[PDB]
Amino acid sequence: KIIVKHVTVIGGGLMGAGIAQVAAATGHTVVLVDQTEDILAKSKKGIEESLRKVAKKKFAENPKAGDEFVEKTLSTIATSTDAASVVHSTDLVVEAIVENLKVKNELFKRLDKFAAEHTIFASNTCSLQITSIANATTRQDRFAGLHFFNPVPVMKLVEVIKTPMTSQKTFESLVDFSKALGKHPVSCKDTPGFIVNRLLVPYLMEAIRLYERGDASKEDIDTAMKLGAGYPMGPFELLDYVGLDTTKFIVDGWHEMDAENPLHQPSPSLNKLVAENKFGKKTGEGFYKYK
Amino acid sequence: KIIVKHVTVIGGGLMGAGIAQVAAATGHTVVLVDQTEDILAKSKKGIEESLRKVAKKKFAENPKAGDEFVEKTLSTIATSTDAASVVHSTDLVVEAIVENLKVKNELFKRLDKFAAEHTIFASNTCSLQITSIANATTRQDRFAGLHFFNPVPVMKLVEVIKTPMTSQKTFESLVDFSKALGKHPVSCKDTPGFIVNRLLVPYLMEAIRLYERGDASKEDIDTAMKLGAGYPMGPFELLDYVGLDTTKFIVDGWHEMDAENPLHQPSPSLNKLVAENKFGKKTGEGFYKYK
Ligand SMILES: CC(=O)CC(=O)SCCNC(=O)CCNC(=O)[C@H](O)C(C)(C)COP(=O)(O)OP(=O)(O)OC[C@H]1O[C@@H](n2cnc3c(N)ncnc32)[C@H](O)[C@@H]1OP(=O)(O)O
Numbered sequence: 001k002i003i004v005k006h007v008t009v010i011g012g013g014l015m016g017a018g019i020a021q022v023a024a025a026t027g028h029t030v031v032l033v034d035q036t037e038d039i040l041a042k043s044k045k046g047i048e049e050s051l052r053k054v055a056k057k058k059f060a061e062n063p064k065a066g067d068e069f070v071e072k073t074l075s076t077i078a079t080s081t082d083a084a085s086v087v088h089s090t091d092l093v094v095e096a097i098v099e100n101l102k103v104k105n106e107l108f109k110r111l112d113k114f115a116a117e118h119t120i121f122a123s124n125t126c127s128l129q130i131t132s133i134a135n136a137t138t139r140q141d142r143f144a145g146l147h148f149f150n151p152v153p154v155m156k157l158v159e160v161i162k163t164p165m166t167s168q169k170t171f172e173s174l175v176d177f178s179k180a181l182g183k184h185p186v187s188c189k190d191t192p193g194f195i196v197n198r199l200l201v202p203y204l205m206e207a208i209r210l211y212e213r214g215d216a217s218k219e220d221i222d223t224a225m226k227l228g229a230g231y232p233m234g235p236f237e238l239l240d241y242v243g244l245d246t247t248k249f250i251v252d253g254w255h256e257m258d259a260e261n262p263l264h265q266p267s268p269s270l271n272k273l274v275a276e277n278k279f280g281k282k283t284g285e286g287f288y289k290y291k
Numbered sequence: 292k293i294i295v296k297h298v299t300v301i302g303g304g305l306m307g308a309g310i311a312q313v314a315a316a317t318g319h320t321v322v323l324v325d326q327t328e329d330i331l332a333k334s335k336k337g338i339e340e341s342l343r344k345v346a347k348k349k350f351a352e353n354p355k356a357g358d359e360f361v362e363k364t365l366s367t368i369a370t371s372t373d374a375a376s377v378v379h380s381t382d383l384v385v386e387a388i389v390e391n392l393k394v395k396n397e398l399f400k401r402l403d404k405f406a407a408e409h410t411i412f413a414s415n416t417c418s419l420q421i422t423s424i425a426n427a428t429t430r431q432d433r434f435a436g437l438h439f440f441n442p443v444p445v446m447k448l449v450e451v452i453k454t455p456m457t458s459q460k461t462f463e464s465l466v467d468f469s470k471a472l473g474k475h476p477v478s479c480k481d482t483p484g485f486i487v488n489r490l491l492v493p494y495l496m497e498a499i500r501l502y503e504r505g506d507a508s509k510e511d512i513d514t515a516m517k518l519g520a521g522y523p524m525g526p527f528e529l530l531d532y533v534g535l536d537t538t539k540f541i542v543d544g545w546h547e548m549d550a551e552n553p554l555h556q557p558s559p560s561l562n563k564l565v566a567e568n569k570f571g572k573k574t575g576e577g578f579y580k581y582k
Pocket residue numbers: 050051053054057126148149150151153154155196197200232233238242519520521
């Protein structure tokens with residue numbers, strides 16, 4: 001049973017950056033990997049802002065301690081554009097790239113050849129099947145899902161997904177790691193969307209359909225869900241927060257799998273926004289515009 | 292335009308009691324109505340208890356102010372077992388009885404005969420069509436939906452639903468009343484479930500279906516939604532909190548309306564609990580067991 005200490009995070013986007021931030025803030029040595037040096041600089045810069053906020057609040061009285069905290073956490077995050085070399089010796093690979101089965105499979109099939117034998121592979125996928133991605137490698141006993149929640153520095157949940165091939169030792173290492181991160185792991189079966197997404201995503205699509213039906217405005221729906229059901233964000237605010245591209249990819253995947261299911265019927269409005277590269281907060285504009 | 296001062300709340304259950312409490316607390320003369328003196332007594336006791344908890348927080352540093360608030364509010368709430376004896380001199384009727392169309396129509400048809408000419412009729416229905424209930428009377432211009440959220444003393448949202456026949460005068464009186472109650476009114480179309488329910492209830496059913504599938508436990512599903520989506524309550528805690536009998540009625544109505552729609556397929560587990568008279572917190576046991 002390995003103890004996760006050196007963590008390789010593939011993808012420095014919304015989730016990848018957050019995962020790297022929390023892992024580094026909790027004493028793990030992290031290596032954040034992405035496609036270009038510019039994307040990585042943007043990711044690390046973003047992680048700094050997220051930590052800076054904490055510092056200015058959590059260390060109001062002790063400013064120097066705050067800076068030290070921010071600097072030390074950032075220093076614990078290395079960057080690279082060559083995953084293959086980085087995984088040679090790493091305890092865990094947490095993949096957080098585009099929600100696309102083929103792309104993830106190709107990624108893991110390749111890394112499986114460069115990673116040390118003890119290395120554990122984990123996918124932060126929202127809707128794909130872990131068993132499917134695991135079989136893209138010959139390391140199934142060391143493969144499982146480790147699903148975090150947006151934004152990683154705040155959301156306490158982490159869904160741990162075993163495939164029937166995942167070993168108890170691998171499972172345990174991931175559970176321990178989740179806790180070391182200060183998170184609350186919940187073991188889930190390898191079913192589409194696991195728990196949260198399986199219930200959240202269809203709800204967000206119903207929200208869009210209500211709007212498309214012409215029954216209410218996005219503003220009123222968001223206001224209603226927040227003031228009537230006590231939700232932190234209305235569905236449209238949340239969609240933009242999460243990313244319209246990721247949501248669309250998720251629903252398209254389920255749609256292909258069960259085309260006759262009306263619950264996975266894609267949305268024209270959603271498709272139009274994604275087609276115009278308006279992914280929400282990521283790009284500065286989604287259902288709503290952001291400065 | 293009439294300014295609502297006297298309100299007759301019919302039904303002293305979860306919502307009725309809450310509506311009567313807030314109205315009285317905000318300076319309206321209230322008459323709470325229910326089937327028996329005993330039921331009314333229990334309702335009044337619950338309201339008093341609710342008021343004291345409010346006093347503890349709102350008047351923590353002034354016990355006397357707290358006592359006066361509790362006393363004044365309770366003395367503003369009169370009771371009667373027959374609303375017909377009250378409506379001839381009331382400004383607004385807010386109905387909050389069992390979620391059943393036939394029963395609601397029977398009630399309004401009768402009150403229509405006793406109510407004063409200017410009296411506005413409002414239904415707090417969750418899933419029925421306001422137009423249908425309105426046509427049970429010949430006062431459609433003074434009929435509309437006024438939908439509050441559980442618990443009324445806390446939830447700020449209030450969906451105001453006018454029908455094609457609702458007069459502007461009636462609508463504005465209800466918007467003004469909502470604000471007088473310190474609420475945030477949102478005008479909604481007369482469509483099934485209006486805004487919130489149309490989106491929330493199908494989600495709650497999916498939570499149940501996921502559980503019945505054996506994919507996960509109610510406890511983990513609740514934990515996941517609270518920690519992953521930041522919801523105040525897990526779906527099962529909310530279900531018991533809202534009332535399983537009410538939820539079942541809501542869905543049965545929509546199901547009869549569109550039998551093939553996967554959104555409204557009845558739950559065997561939900562039907563069984565209701566059949567065994569386990570409606571949730573209000574009965575001491577629903578999906579979970581309470582004191
Ligand atoms: C998409 C999928 O398939 C999978 C999934 O992940 S589903 C999406 C799951 N996530 C959600 O549902 C998001 C729902 N929204 C929320 O829970 C909340 O709105 C939120 C966590 C985003 C925070 O919103 P908020 O309450 O308004 O806080 P905000 O006003 O934004 O910031 C203030 C607080 O939040 C924290 N915060 C917010 N974002 C932060 C970040 N990225 N890093 C560090 N702290 C942050 C601050 O530390 C601050 O703490 P204090 O209250 O002590 O001062």
